[PDB]
Amino acid sequence: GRVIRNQRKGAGSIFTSHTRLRQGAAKLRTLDYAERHGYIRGIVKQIVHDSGRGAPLAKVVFRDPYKYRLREEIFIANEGVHTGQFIYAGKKASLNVGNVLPLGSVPEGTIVSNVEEKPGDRGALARASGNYVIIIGHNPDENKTRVRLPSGAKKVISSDARGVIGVIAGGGRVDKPLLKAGRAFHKYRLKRNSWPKTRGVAMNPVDHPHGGGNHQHIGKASTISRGAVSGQKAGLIAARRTGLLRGSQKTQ
Amino acid sequence: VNVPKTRKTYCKGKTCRKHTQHKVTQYKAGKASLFAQGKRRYDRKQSGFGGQTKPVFHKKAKTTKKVVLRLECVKCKTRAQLTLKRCKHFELGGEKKQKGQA
Amino acid sequence: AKSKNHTAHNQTRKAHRNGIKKPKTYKYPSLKGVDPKFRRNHKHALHGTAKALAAAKK
RNA sequence: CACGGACCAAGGAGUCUAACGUCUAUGCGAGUGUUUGGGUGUAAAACCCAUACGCGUAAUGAAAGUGAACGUAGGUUGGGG
RNA sequence: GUCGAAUUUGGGUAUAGGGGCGAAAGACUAAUCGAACCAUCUAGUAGCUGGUUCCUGCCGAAGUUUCCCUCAGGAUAGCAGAAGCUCGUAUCAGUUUUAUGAGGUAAAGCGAAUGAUUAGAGGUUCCGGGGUCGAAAUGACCUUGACCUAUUCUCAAACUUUAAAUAUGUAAGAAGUCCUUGUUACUUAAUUGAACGUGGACAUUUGAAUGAAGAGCUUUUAGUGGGCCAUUUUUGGUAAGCAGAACUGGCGAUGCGGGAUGAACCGAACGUAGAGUUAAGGUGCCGGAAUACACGCUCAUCAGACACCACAAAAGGUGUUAG
RNA sequence: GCCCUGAAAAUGGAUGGCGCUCAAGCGUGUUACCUAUACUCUACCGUCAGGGUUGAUAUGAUGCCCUGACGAGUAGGCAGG
RNA sequence: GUGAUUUCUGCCCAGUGCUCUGAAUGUCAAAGUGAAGAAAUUCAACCAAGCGCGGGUAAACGGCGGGAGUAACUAUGACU
RNA sequence: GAAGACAUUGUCAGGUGGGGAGUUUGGCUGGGGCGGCACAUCUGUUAAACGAUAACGCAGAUGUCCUAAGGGGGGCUCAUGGAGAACAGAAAUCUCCAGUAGAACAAAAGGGUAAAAGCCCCCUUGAUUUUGAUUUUCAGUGUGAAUACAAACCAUGAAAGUGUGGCCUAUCGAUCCUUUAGUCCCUCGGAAUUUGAGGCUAGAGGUGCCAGAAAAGUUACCACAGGGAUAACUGGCUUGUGGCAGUCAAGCGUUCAUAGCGACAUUGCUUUUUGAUUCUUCGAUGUCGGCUCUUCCUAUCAUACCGAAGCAGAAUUCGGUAA
RNA sequence: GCGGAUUUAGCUCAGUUGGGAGAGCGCCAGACUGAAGAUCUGGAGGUCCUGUGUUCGAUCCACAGAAUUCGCACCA
RNA sequence: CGCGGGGUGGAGCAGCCCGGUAGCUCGUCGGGCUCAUAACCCGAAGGUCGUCGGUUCAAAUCCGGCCCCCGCAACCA
RNA sequence: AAGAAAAUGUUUU
Ligand SMILES: [K+]
Ligand SMILES: [K+]
Ligand SMILES: [K+]
Ligand SMILES: [K+]
Ligand SMILES: [K+]
Ligand SMILES: [K+]
Ligand SMILES: [K+]
Ligand SMILES: [K+]
Ligand SMILES: [K+]
Ligand SMILES: [Mg+2]
Ligand SMILES: [Mg+2]
Ligand SMILES: [Mg+2]
Ligand SMILES: [Mg+2]
Ligand SMILES: [Mg+2]
Ligand SMILES: [Mg+2]
Ligand SMILES: [Mg+2]
Ligand SMILES: [Mg+2]
Ligand SMILES: [Mg+2]
Ligand SMILES: [Mg+2]
Ligand SMILES: [Mg+2]
Ligand SMILES: [Mg+2]
Ligand SMILES: [Mg+2]
Ligand SMILES: [Mg+2]
Ligand SMILES: [Mg+2]
Ligand SMILES: [Mg+2]
Ligand SMILES: [Mg+2]
Ligand SMILES: [Mg+2]
Ligand SMILES: [Mg+2]
Ligand SMILES: [Mg+2]
Ligand SMILES: [Mg+2]
Ligand SMILES: [Mg+2]
Ligand SMILES: [Mg+2]
Ligand SMILES: [Mg+2]
Ligand SMILES: [Mg+2]
Ligand SMILES: [Mg+2]
Ligand SMILES: [Mg+2]
Ligand SMILES: [Mg+2]
Ligand SMILES: [Mg+2]
Ligand SMILES: [Mg+2]
Ligand SMILES: [Mg+2]
Ligand SMILES: [Mg+2]
Ligand SMILES: [Mg+2]
Ligand SMILES: [Mg+2]
Ligand SMILES: [Mg+2]
Ligand SMILES: [Mg+2]
Ligand SMILES: [Mg+2]
Ligand SMILES: [Mg+2]
Ligand SMILES: [Mg+2]
Ligand SMILES: [Mg+2]
Ligand SMILES: [Mg+2]
Ligand SMILES: [Mg+2]
Ligand SMILES: [Mg+2]
Ligand SMILES: [Mg+2]
Ligand SMILES: [Mg+2]
Ligand SMILES: [Mg+2]
Ligand SMILES: [Mg+2]
Ligand SMILES: [Mg+2]
Ligand SMILES: [Mg+2]
Ligand SMILES: [Mg+2]
Ligand SMILES: [Mg+2]
Ligand SMILES: [Mg+2]
Ligand SMILES: [Mg+2]
Ligand SMILES: [Mg+2]
Ligand SMILES: [Mg+2]
Ligand SMILES: [Mg+2]
Ligand SMILES: [Zn+2]
């Protein structure tokens, strides 16, 4: 009879992200004439920690081509990028780690990061620590690039979409056990109010579909239809299968 | 029960008004028509919000229905109706009883 | 919570308070159930008797 | 050894209305109802009034419709006076 | 318990009621939480609980019938009041008698039917066959079982020939008995009959008894629709101050005298008084009234002492009494 | 027949109590006596009923008067106050 | 969902769920189409998803019985 | 830059949708539940010889079945027994005799029935039409069932007659809606025709909770109105059961019924068992046990004093007065 | 405590109608073998749990006990 | 109310989809194979196809019902 | 180029 927790999250009162300490949105440069036709050289001034983000950010300063001033950009630092390094962004930039190139300007097998889903969105794909996108092919006519995403999905993107050569820094982060409720607490204190999590079976029927009973148990299948409604989508939503995953991925 | 056809019985057809031969059939209700005033009223009542607006009978107890014979006079075609007692198996065809069979 | 089921107790006393009334016999009882053929002929006979006694007044 | 009641004062519960059944009183009576309204006034009173309208004087039928004296408005039995 | 981090805490800020918030207790959300508070709808509805305000006079119930999503309610009939009305040369009646029906309970019956049921006897050894011989039969016995015959003991709510008592229908006149002959489309072979008529005779007991604050008629409404008790009939139950019926009388609704006491038992029902007499019950004293009269019986180291009723049995006793 | 044995329950206690032994017990018989709101008679109240009396000084005919019977009451009805 | 570590997580997809095929289609709305009719209308074909059918899935919900026979004392059955 | 008449958006339509809303989730009842149906009914009995009459009384039955197992007629006579006839015996078919029904009649039971109501055969559709009256249940409403006629048309028989379903007593269903038959009748209201619709009369599709709502749970989170009309204590009635005690005395006890026991029976007491009941208490009598403490009972374990013994002593057993 | 059931050749079971007592397995023999084992044939095997009970008799007609167990109850 | 899937040797099934016609496996029995046993191979028995009519030259096969079982769709007395 | 199935046999002489 009560609005369940996953329903309450959408109102965004206490479930908003804790963004106070964050350095700013990590984005590529705005796609401009210099990047569309040649390249522009920036300088990596600082490699800094972003609160709530595993990957470090790189503050990169470019000259403004149209006004005498500097423009600071917040890239997601690729591993091996250092302070004082010159970053080259544009169609004519070299195939060096940290450079920002259009997807169509790199050969097959290139490893890129912070890849734009569309040209000029300034980076959407392979942004988390240790992640990267692989260029697996080009279709020059109707200019598109086929890429492999961290999840293993194959995606077709415009060849004018940009990416940073290399892998996002900070990889291996999840290999260390948190070892402590307090460490999970401090992790999520800087992300959002999603921790700790009460099990639905530990609640009452009013609070959750899984609540109630003289034993803790789901009672009905935890696999929930894709067409179910809000307040019903607790458990395994639209699960194709359940159980300990035995077998191969990358289905043909 | 076994009821024969051909039924010589009274006819009220205003031309016979007397015992004539009748053809016997089993009466079937016939399709419920739209545009019957009750159906029109029911559809209008059902339209919109409010859900089901009239009873839907559920507590069925009868296991039979009363068989109605339609008696059509062979001369004037006037039809009469005769209700029988409740029966579980009704047949109009022949195969009459035989006495002394093994 | 069960209760009493039936009794005729006090019923004869109630009946006799206003008494068992005999059914007030009348001369010329009604002809309600009489055979209709007899009634038809009786009507014709009575009409004929009435006409005869009307002419008999001299 | 069921419930309310320590005590006292004051307050405290079948009312009014619309439409009705029976009965009764009254007026008039095949009619009845002046009071919507009008006239008038000593001014929310009293007094006066046309046309309608309501009920009644006719019933019956789903309806179209039809529509109440053979007779001293009947015969018989009883019937107060 | 914990006490240096999932720590404690101020202030600011956000989330608001089928909403929030919840390290999850249905916890917390201003002493309010399995849905806050405030106002209004709202005097919400209640077959349920409580209350319901002066006097006297007269009459005076029901807890039963039928129907109901009915079983703590209602409708309906009944019981009750009121208003009367038409008559009163009068009618009827919780009654008897006489005449005439109906009944299948009590009882009775089972050498009468059905069904139970004890025993012996006489025949089917064909008996159901066996035992035993019989060389072997049933051949001869015995047998247990049945069958048949005449007997015999005992039974029946769902057996019965018979068959009460109580209870019960009808009649006991003038709307009667009889006689003559008119109508009909009914009926008859037919004025044959049927029914209804016209005319005529029959009042002291007009056709048993007793009674009759009269009889008949109508309208309209109240309450009630939990009952219970006693004698008798009676069902279930070991039984019950149990549960369920029949008839009547009661209590409820009722005081009074008696049973010490007590709703129901006995007696008797009630305006205010006086006198007399009684009922039931009593009369040593409490306590009004004989420590009356009479014939017996009883002695109890648990005597007994008035029905309902407030308990006692089988079995025993040279106690004592009478047979 | 009476008495006794049979005959054991919890606060101290009940032929009602006291007490009673040719009873003040049990069975039976005869009288006298006591006393209910009952019965009889009388008065008074009311109710109901049947009657008399508009013939005068008559203002109370809803009055006055005569006669007889009757009186319990919850729920409830009605009446007069 | 489970609940440090260690060790291990068996069998079962028939059911209820969840999730993907084949549609020489079964079910099948409104609109649309055809016929009949003076029309209202009726009838018919077509007919989306869904359902149905088929497949997958249990660290989804869950389930994990019974009987028969069979070892050279018996018993029990490794076995069928 | 992408995208493109596709998304989107608007309306309708199908699916999905406890996420959410609203609601419901019988009755009787020896508390309620579970069970059952005593809820609509029928036979016999309870039932007390008119009628009526209750219980979750007793023994059973009903929601069907039948074109004949309805209607008419004719002929015949059944169960069973005995005596006979190849296979054939205890049972097959044939014969006679006896045969009051001991058979059969759809079903439960009761009644009824012998030239039949049964068995067999022949002909049939009265299991029809019209609308009334009547009996039972009963309010003298409905429904079901049934009775006797009338007015038709028929069946059967030589005929008188009989037949308006089943030999009788059970076998069933309102309003509204739908549907069919009938009337070719009424209406569609400015006037017509034709469709369509609506009426009038009779049926049918159904309510079994059977006078007839359309309806799943859970609450140990609970709420309210109430109920001692009603359960879970004590108390009260009862005392089956429990416990305790008698009588008789077949037997046991080597012999001997009774030292001590005691079968088959049978009479009781008690209320420290458990039931049965539902009278008190539901506007509340604090719900186990223990601890503590007092008192009472005696059906006495011990102690006192005794009687008996299958009492030599010792030990023991039975019993008495004794709390 | 109460209500049920089972008491049977050595072991596991069927009985029976007011009769008997059988089946397997076991055991003893015979076929078979050089001799055996198996496999085949056979045979013997109970005084029917105990006491009384009606009978002409009786495991069985038909009663009270003992055991072996199944189930229900024993404080609110 | 409607529409489907069916029903076939003792058991479980094919055959139907436009009729030359009833078979398969398991189970029973017998035979063969092997030196012998098991496995294996074959044959026999076992049903006339749920039922009643019809279309048909002749029906398991088609067409209408009837019985039984299962499933699905629809829902004002 | 290559070519399915084939289990078992009591103890002591
Ligand atoms: K749960
Ligand atoms: K609506
Ligand atoms: K599964
Ligand atoms: K599945
Ligand atoms: K839902
Ligand atoms: K609920
Ligand atoms: K007892
Ligand atoms: K209480
Ligand atoms: K050897
Ligand atoms: Mg923000
Ligand atoms: Mg977690
Ligand atoms: Mg958790
Ligand atoms: Mg919890
Ligand atoms: Mg929920
Ligand atoms: Mg769910
Ligand atoms: Mg729990
Ligand atoms: Mg509309
Ligand atoms: Mg709609
Ligand atoms: Mg009552
Ligand atoms: Mg008291
Ligand atoms: Mg109270
Ligand atoms: Mg008080
Ligand atoms: Mg006052
Ligand atoms: Mg909880
Ligand atoms: Mg009020
Ligand atoms: Mg009185
Ligand atoms: Mg009350
Ligand atoms: Mg009788
Ligand atoms: Mg007798
Ligand atoms: Mg009372
Ligand atoms: Mg009295
Ligand atoms: Mg007394
Ligand atoms: Mg006096
Ligand atoms: Mg004195
Ligand atoms: Mg004695
Ligand atoms: Mg004594
Ligand atoms: Mg005295
Ligand atoms: Mg004396
Ligand atoms: Mg007077
Ligand atoms: Mg009085
Ligand atoms: Mg663990
Ligand atoms: Mg369509
Ligand atoms: Mg589709
Ligand atoms: Mg809900
Ligand atoms: Mg109930
Ligand atoms: Mg009677
Ligand atoms: Mg005859
Ligand atoms: Mg009936
Ligand atoms: Mg006739
Ligand atoms: Mg008849
Ligand atoms: Mg009907
Ligand atoms: Mg209609
Ligand atoms: Mg018009
Ligand atoms: Mg009813
Ligand atoms: Mg009580
Ligand atoms: Mg109790
Ligand atoms: Mg006892
Ligand atoms: Mg009672
Ligand atoms: Mg109190
Ligand atoms: Mg208290
Ligand atoms: Mg107290
Ligand atoms: Mg003693
Ligand atoms: Mg050997
Ligand atoms: Mg072989
Ligand atoms: Mg070898
Ligand atoms: Zn005709």
mmCIF file of N, CA and C (backbone and C1' of nucleotides) in Angstrom, chain E residues 252-269:
data_model
loop_
_atom_site.group_PDB
_atom_site.id
_atom_site.type_symbol
_atom_site.label_atom_id
_atom_site.label_comp_id
_atom_site.label_asym_id
_atom_site.label_seq_id
_atom_site.Cartn_x
_atom_site.Cartn_y
_atom_site.Cartn_z
ATOM 1 P P G E 252 -45.568 -12.313 37.601
ATOM 2 O "O5'" G E 252 -44.710 -12.216 36.261
ATOM 3 C "C5'" G E 252 -43.296 -12.336 36.263
ATOM 4 C "C4'" G E 252 -42.756 -12.327 34.857
ATOM 5 C "C3'" G E 252 -43.079 -11.078 34.059
ATOM 6 O "O3'" G E 252 -42.140 -10.054 34.298
ATOM 7 C "C1'" G E 252 -43.608 -12.989 32.777
ATOM 8 P P A E 253 -42.556 -8.525 34.110
ATOM 9 O "O5'" A E 253 -44.001 -8.462 34.755
ATOM 10 C "C5'" A E 253 -44.648 -7.217 34.948
ATOM 11 C "C4'" A E 253 -46.146 -7.359 34.985
ATOM 12 C "C3'" A E 253 -46.701 -8.445 35.900
ATOM 13 O "O3'" A E 253 -47.887 -7.943 36.503
ATOM 14 C "C1'" A E 253 -47.541 -8.737 33.726
ATOM 15 P P U E 254 -47.824 -6.749 37.577
ATOM 16 O "O5'" U E 254 -48.315 -7.445 38.910
ATOM 17 C "C5'" U E 254 -47.669 -7.208 40.149
ATOM 18 C "C4'" U E 254 -47.904 -8.360 41.084
ATOM 19 C "C3'" U E 254 -46.949 -9.533 40.904
ATOM 20 O "O3'" U E 254 -46.636 -10.097 42.167
ATOM 21 C "C1'" U E 254 -49.182 -10.250 40.531
ATOM 22 P P G E 255 -45.273 -9.679 42.891
ATOM 23 O "O5'" G E 255 -45.741 -8.627 43.982
ATOM 24 C "C5'" G E 255 -46.421 -9.063 45.140
ATOM 25 C "C4'" G E 255 -47.512 -8.112 45.549
ATOM 26 C "C3'" G E 255 -48.291 -8.544 46.778
ATOM 27 O "O3'" G E 255 -47.664 -8.148 47.978
ATOM 28 C "C1'" G E 255 -49.803 -8.065 45.049
ATOM 29 P P C E 256 -47.216 -9.253 49.045
ATOM 30 O "O5'" C E 256 -48.588 -9.714 49.696
ATOM 31 C "C5'" C E 256 -49.537 -8.762 50.144
ATOM 32 C "C4'" C E 256 -50.875 -9.404 50.383
ATOM 33 C "C3'" C E 256 -50.845 -10.709 51.154
ATOM 34 O "O3'" C E 256 -50.742 -10.510 52.549
ATOM 35 C "C1'" C E 256 -52.220 -10.955 49.259
ATOM 36 P P G E 257 -49.586 -11.242 53.381
ATOM 37 O "O5'" G E 257 -50.237 -12.632 53.792
ATOM 38 C "C5'" G E 257 -51.329 -12.690 54.692
ATOM 39 C "C4'" G E 257 -51.883 -14.086 54.796
ATOM 40 C "C3'" G E 257 -50.865 -15.211 54.878
ATOM 41 O "O3'" G E 257 -50.277 -15.371 56.152
ATOM 42 C "C1'" G E 257 -52.479 -15.773 53.287
ATOM 43 P P G E 258 -48.741 -15.819 56.268
ATOM 44 O "O5'" G E 258 -48.738 -17.329 55.775
ATOM 45 C "C5'" G E 258 -49.498 -18.313 56.451
ATOM 46 C "C4'" G E 258 -49.459 -19.633 55.730
ATOM 47 C "C3'" G E 258 -48.087 -20.229 55.488
ATOM 48 O "O3'" G E 258 -47.517 -20.827 56.635
ATOM 49 C "C1'" G E 258 -49.368 -20.412 53.528
ATOM 50 P P G E 259 -45.925 -20.870 56.815
ATOM 51 O "O5'" G E 259 -45.413 -21.729 55.577
ATOM 52 C "C5'" G E 259 -45.740 -23.103 55.468
ATOM 53 C "C4'" G E 259 -45.057 -23.773 54.302
ATOM 54 C "C3'" G E 259 -43.586 -23.486 54.099
ATOM 55 O "O3'" G E 259 -42.751 -24.100 55.058
ATOM 56 C "C1'" G E 259 -44.675 -23.530 52.013
ATOM 57 P P A E 260 -41.364 -23.410 55.459
ATOM 58 O "O5'" A E 260 -41.687 -21.851 55.487
ATOM 59 C "C5'" A E 260 -42.146 -21.204 56.664
ATOM 60 C "C4'" A E 260 -41.180 -20.138 57.112
ATOM 61 C "C3'" A E 260 -40.609 -19.256 56.009
ATOM 62 O "O3'" A E 260 -41.436 -18.130 55.771
ATOM 63 C "C1'" A E 260 -38.867 -20.038 57.441
ATOM 64 P P U E 261 -41.620 -17.527 54.298
ATOM 65 O "O5'" U E 261 -40.137 -17.385 53.743
ATOM 66 C "C5'" U E 261 -39.354 -16.232 54.007
ATOM 67 C "C4'" U E 261 -37.983 -16.375 53.406
ATOM 68 C "C3'" U E 261 -37.956 -16.595 51.901
ATOM 69 O "O3'" U E 261 -37.941 -15.364 51.201
ATOM 70 C "C1'" U E 261 -36.556 -18.187 52.992
ATOM 71 P P G E 262 -39.178 -14.903 50.291
ATOM 72 O "O5'" G E 262 -38.816 -15.475 48.855
ATOM 73 C "C5'" G E 262 -37.506 -15.319 48.333
ATOM 74 C "C4'" G E 262 -37.203 -16.332 47.263
ATOM 75 C "C3'" G E 262 -38.218 -16.404 46.120
ATOM 76 O "O3'" G E 262 -37.536 -16.565 44.882
ATOM 77 C "C1'" G E 262 -37.912 -18.541 47.054
ATOM 78 P P A E 263 -37.896 -15.603 43.655
ATOM 79 O "O5'" A E 263 -39.398 -15.991 43.296
ATOM 80 C "C5'" A E 263 -40.418 -15.007 43.279
ATOM 81 C "C4'" A E 263 -41.355 -15.196 42.114
ATOM 82 C "C3'" A E 263 -41.873 -16.604 41.892
ATOM 83 O "O3'" A E 263 -43.017 -16.847 42.689
ATOM 84 C "C1'" A E 263 -41.211 -15.618 39.825
ATOM 85 P P A E 264 -43.278 -18.275 43.357
ATOM 86 O "O5'" A E 264 -44.070 -19.076 42.241
ATOM 87 C "C5'" A E 264 -45.094 -18.455 41.477
ATOM 88 C "C4'" A E 264 -45.362 -19.225 40.212
ATOM 89 C "C3'" A E 264 -45.518 -20.733 40.408
ATOM 90 O "O3'" A E 264 -46.561 -21.235 39.580
ATOM 91 C "C1'" A E 264 -43.818 -20.304 38.832
ATOM 92 P P C E 265 -47.709 -22.142 40.233
ATOM 93 O "O5'" C E 265 -46.911 -23.125 41.195
ATOM 94 C "C5'" C E 265 -46.806 -24.514 40.925
ATOM 95 C "C4'" C E 265 -46.892 -25.301 42.205
ATOM 96 C "C3'" C E 265 -48.139 -25.033 43.032
ATOM 97 O "O3'" C E 265 -49.223 -25.857 42.640
ATOM 98 C "C1'" C E 265 -46.222 -24.825 44.404
ATOM 99 P P C E 266 -50.720 -25.287 42.612
ATOM 100 O "O5'" C E 266 -51.187 -25.374 44.125
ATOM 101 C "C5'" C E 266 -51.044 -26.568 44.874
ATOM 102 C "C4'" C E 266 -51.364 -26.320 46.323
ATOM 103 C "C3'" C E 266 -52.573 -25.435 46.571
ATOM 104 O "O3'" C E 266 -53.797 -26.137 46.510
ATOM 105 C "C1'" C E 266 -50.766 -24.656 47.858
ATOM 106 P P G E 267 -55.036 -25.511 45.714
ATOM 107 O "O5'" G E 267 -55.437 -24.232 46.567
ATOM 108 C "C5'" G E 267 -55.967 -24.378 47.872
ATOM 109 C "C4'" G E 267 -56.083 -23.061 48.589
ATOM 110 C "C3'" G E 267 -56.827 -21.948 47.880
ATOM 111 O "O3'" G E 267 -58.231 -22.106 47.887
ATOM 112 C "C1'" G E 267 -54.887 -21.080 48.885
ATOM 113 P P A E 268 -59.089 -21.651 46.612
ATOM 114 O "O5'" A E 268 -58.881 -20.076 46.535
ATOM 115 C "C5'" A E 268 -59.434 -19.212 47.514
ATOM 116 C "C4'" A E 268 -58.763 -17.862 47.507
ATOM 117 C "C3'" A E 268 -58.946 -17.024 46.253
ATOM 118 O "O3'" A E 268 -60.175 -16.325 46.239
ATOM 119 C "C1'" A E 268 -56.667 -17.072 46.813
ATOM 120 P P A E 269 -60.970 -16.084 44.868
ATOM 121 O "O5'" A E 269 -60.307 -14.778 44.248
ATOM 122 C "C5'" A E 269 -59.217 -14.857 43.344
ATOM 123 C "C4'" A E 269 -58.184 -13.812 43.664
ATOM 124 C "C3'" A E 269 -58.521 -12.388 43.275
ATOM 125 O "O3'" A E 269 -59.435 -11.793 44.173
ATOM 126 C "C1'" A E 269 -56.248 -12.863 42.786
#
